Amino acid sequence: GNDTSEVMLLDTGWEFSQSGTEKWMPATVPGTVHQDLISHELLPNPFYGMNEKKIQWVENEDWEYRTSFIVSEEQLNRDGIQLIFEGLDTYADVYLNGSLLLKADNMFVGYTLPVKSVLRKGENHLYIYFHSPIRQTLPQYASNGFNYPADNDHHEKHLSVFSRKAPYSYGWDWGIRMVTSGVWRPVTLRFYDIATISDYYVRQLSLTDENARLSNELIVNQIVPQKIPAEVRVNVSLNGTTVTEVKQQVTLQPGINHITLPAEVTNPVRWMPNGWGTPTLYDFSAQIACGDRIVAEQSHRIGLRTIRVVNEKDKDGESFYFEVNGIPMFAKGANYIPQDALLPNVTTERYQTLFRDMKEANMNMVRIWGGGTYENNLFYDLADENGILVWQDFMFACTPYPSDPTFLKRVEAEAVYNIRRLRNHASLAMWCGNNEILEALKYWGFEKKFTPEVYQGLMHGYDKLFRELLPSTVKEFDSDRFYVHSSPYLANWGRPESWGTGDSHNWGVWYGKKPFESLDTDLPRFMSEFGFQSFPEMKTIAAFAAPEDYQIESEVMNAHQKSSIGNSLIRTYMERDYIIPESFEDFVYVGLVLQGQGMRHGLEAHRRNRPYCMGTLYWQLNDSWPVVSWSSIDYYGNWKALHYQAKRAFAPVLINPIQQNDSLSVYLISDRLDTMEQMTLEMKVVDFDGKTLGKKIQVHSLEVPANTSKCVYRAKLDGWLTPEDCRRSFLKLILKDKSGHQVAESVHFFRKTKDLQLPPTSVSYQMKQTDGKCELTLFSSMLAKDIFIETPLQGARYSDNFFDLLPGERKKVIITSPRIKKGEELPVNIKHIRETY
Ligand SMILES: *[C@H]1[C@H](N)[C@H](CO)[C@@H](O)[C@H](O)[C@@H]1O
Ligand SMILES: [Br-]
Ligand SMILES: [Br-]
Ligand SMILES: [Br-]
Ligand SMILES: [Br-]
Ligand SMILES: [Br-]
Ligand SMILES: [Br-]
Ligand SMILES: [Cl-]
Ligand SMILES: [Cl-]
Ligand SMILES: [Cl-]
Ligand SMILES: [Cl-]
Ligand SMILES: [Cl-]
Ligand SMILES: [Cl-]
Ligand code: NA
Ligand code: NA
């Protein structure tokens, strides 16, 4: 960083051409073939209506990129010059001034190339030829004798498995097929003296409250022929002030040098996850000094913490949980997918907003699921500074893969590159070999699809990749981080004997058609996947569809559904709990309410059942395009009802009323580090007009210990509420400390929404609108159920939404958007259940 090197970004002056046309046009780099075409209206909007079919032709053509740049005489006399490609998608021939520098074959590898002997004083010409990844792999497929069973690869021929390229680019059961190419990450040229730091690893040797012991491991590449005396320095600082400083004398030899400097931090300030404290980061800087001058420098942000994954046999089967700084931590978060069909269109602002969405929803963990990418350095920096643990899959999902020597050598290159790239992040907690490949080999009926000899080949192939190569590479390069070969590693949703062993993917809800209530009984040791779909709200549907298409199974809505079951299954689930509205608009509103309430029920069952269950990661956080899917946040950044419900279900203190077998239990759930003493629970039945039925019920002298779920109240329904009252009232619950200050509250309904006697009502609101802001006060004299405050403004944020407005209780809501202007009244439309029939 702060050294005598000069860096030139090659981010301007690029042109592209469809190969064999000789027509050139301006391009943006980093970027994609598809975005470059869109920018010159050579493709329609890939996301609108039926346009998916209309853009498939791009994957059959080859594509060429070129730029030129100036090098001075002074630059050419530096000791060394490197050209760095952080990403090429995928089969790319790189030519500089007549030299073939590189034949790239892995989207997930960065390439560092020496170019000083090939550079010229004046103009320099860089050309890149991108072979179609389809045409490049058709002969490979022809030679194979069988088709890999990759059902998410939306083509007769399943060519995805032969290419180290983002699996979802070929299609997915929530995804558009956009098999793109190009310079997907930045290109840089570094001019320097003596040497570069190829790698800086801060290895934590031990950590106690009294001391942290580190080993600073440096790989230094020396480009000059002489022996060079040098001083290696490491500076450890906190908030700009030096904590400790160490140095070592060396003489650097030509080529690779290994340097190790120990360092200690007495009374260390620990990194803590979101909800448990501050995600404190130290600045570790390494310098190579030759005389006056600092020839190379590299820094990392470093969090001092311990992370142990506990996976041991016990009385219930096999445990699966995270211990952070010595304390077992119930996991709360979601599975993350790519934010766009076109990865470089995802901006810094969009990454910062997604981490804001996770932190505000009380999350402490994200799984980077194995059909996407190894994410960019910014994703992992934001995880570090927001206290969110990362579960990292390798990029293999839902099919067996090849295991021939050439293919395994490509995989080894990506594994070593991305382990060294990511191993200094505080957030990084564990590596996972793949998503569901063992499950697929055991249970998806491959015995019947292939010969005995091919099935046998697939099974031996699984072990070579997932039980040998990947675990050895983690042992060698990240030896204190946990690795598991697959998620889920043994449990099957169809086999209850197996649920006590490791993590679960519960396909029972959605694919199995089970009701949401099944989640109270079908418990795992750790839920790493479960979910339910929704249509996104109307302002997103209008981005891909017209009013002619507003039907659950129109041609266009079916084109924005990629699951087998499809859109009618949502109708099937809705009927069990809600009256089905006639309006499409009203159906969509109720679908959002449905997904939120059903999933929140599962999240609550998982926390309630700790310590048998030690975490829950729902499917899925986010969307790559305008689509019907399992997401809690649509493509445009709009929170669905699920996201507000995840935030509530993940609250550090939670009152959880649960009704089973005509009785009510109330559990108090805490992920706090401190115990709470002398607490009062208070409850009160209130009818849909605001009249108390009976007296208040009070439970005193309650203890809520750190990191526990405990029952503190049970009562039969017969003898308390009339069946008529269960249709016409709700329970208010509140938790207060010794002094009577409120620390939590909850609302309970005794019957399904469709069996409620909801009074017709209207929600009135006053509005005060300034620049960037609108403050609403809401009022109804009768209960309004599950209200949705709807506005046309894309990405508008709400203090709250998708909540019950209680009878004669005024409610303040704040709406923020940089697009909100004083004197330009924001349109507001307030929906509620009773209005839909
Ligand atoms: C789980 C997800 N629910 C889908 C199938 O139900 C599919 O994306 C994949 O199997 C995921 O792991
Ligand atoms: Br060089
Ligand atoms: Br180099
Ligand atoms: Br050495
Ligand atoms: Br990047
Ligand atoms: Br293993
Ligand atoms: Br019941
Ligand atoms: Cl020196
Ligand atoms: Cl937490
Ligand atoms: Cl076969
Ligand atoms: Cl219909
Ligand atoms: Cl309820
Ligand atoms: Cl009404
Ligand atoms: Na990079
Ligand atoms: Na919990």
Backbone φ and ψ for 748, nearest 5 degrees, come out as: -125, 130
Residue among 217, 222, 375, 353 nearest 290 (CA)? 222
619 within ligand 1 shell (Cβ under 6 A): yes
Quote the crossing angle between the two packed helices 405-422 and 470-477, to the nearest 10°: 30
Q: What is the token pair recorded at 10?
A: 């090659």
Strands 527-529 and 742-748: unpaired
Backbone φ and ψ for 96, nearest 5 degrees, come out as: -125, 120
What distance in Å separates the CA atoms of residue 618 and residue 630, rounded to the nearest whole number? 9
Tokens 């990292």 locate to 392
Mutate to test the pocket of ligand 1, among 152, 336, 399, 507 (most ligand atoms within 8 A of CB): 507
435 within ligand 1 shell (Cβ under 6 A): yes
Using the mean position of ligand 7's atoms as its centre, give its distance from the Cα of residue 781 in Å: 29
What distance in Å separates the CA atoms of residue 495 and residue 777, rounded to the nearest whole number? 51
Tokens 């564990």 locate to 430
Q: Are 371 and 169 in contact (CB under 8 A)?
A: no
Q: Are 794 and 539 in contact (CB under 8 A)?
A: yes
Closest C-alpha to ligand 1, atom 8:
173
Burial class of residue 570, CB neighbours in 10 A (0-12, 13-18, 19+): buried
Tokens 């802001």 locate to 773
What distance in Å separates the CA atoms of residue 783 and residue 759, rounded to the nearest whole number? 8
DSSP string computed for 276-289: TS-B--EEEEEEEE
What distance in Å separates the CA atoms of residue 817 and residue 578, rounded to the nearest whole number? 33
531 within ligand 1 shell (Cβ under 6 A): yes
Residue among 360, 587, 394 nearest 487 (CA)? 394
**Which residue type occupies 355?**
F
Domain boundaries, the chain: 1-193, 194-303, 304-650, 651-752, 753-837
Resolution of this model in Å is 2.0
Q: What is the token pair recorded at 331?
A: 């996991």
393 within ligand 1 shell (Cβ under 6 A): no
- Strands of 649-691, DSSP E: 653-660, 663-670, 676-687
Cβ atoms within 10 Å of 662's Cβ, excluding its own: 10
| Gyration radius of the chain over CA positions | 29
The shares of helix, strand and coil residues in the chain, as percent rounded to the nearest 5, are 25, 35, 40
507 within ligand 1 shell (Cβ under 6 A): yes
DSSP string computed for 611-624: TT--EEEES-S--S
How many angstroms separate the Cα of 753 from the Cα of each of 223, 602, 662, 730, 780? Answer: 72, 18, 17, 12, 19
Contacts of 33 (CB under 8 A, 6+ apart): 16, 58, 63, 130, 180, 181, 182
Using the mean position of ligand 7's atoms as its centre, give its distance from the Cα of residue 660 in Å: 4
What distance in Å separates the CA atoms of residue 761 and residue 778, rounded to the nearest whole number? 13
- Length in residues, the chain: 837
Using the mean position of ligand 6's atoms as its centre, give its distance from the Cα of residue 679 in Å: 47
Residue among 267, 266, 299, 298 nearest 282 (CA)? 299
**Which residue type occupies 78?**
R
Q: What is the token pair recorded at 352?
A: 């910062």
Closest C-alpha to ligand 1, atom 1:
529
Q: Are 654 and 669 in contact (CB under 8 A)?
A: yes
What distance in Å separates the CA atoms of residue 446 and residue 423, rounded to the nearest whole number? 37
**Which residue type occupies 141?**
Y
What distance in Å separates the CA atoms of residue 662 and residue 409, rounded to the nearest whole number? 61
What distance in Å separates the CA atoms of residue 645 and residue 803, rounded to the nearest whole number? 9
What distance in Å separates the CA atoms of residue 770 and residue 774, rounded to the nearest whole number? 6
Enumerate long-range contacts of 660-663, CB under 8 Å, 24 or more apart: 660/520, 662/716, 662/717, 662/718, 663/714, 663/715, 663/716, 663/717
Tokens 């409850």 locate to 683
Closest C-alpha to ligand 1, atom 9:
398
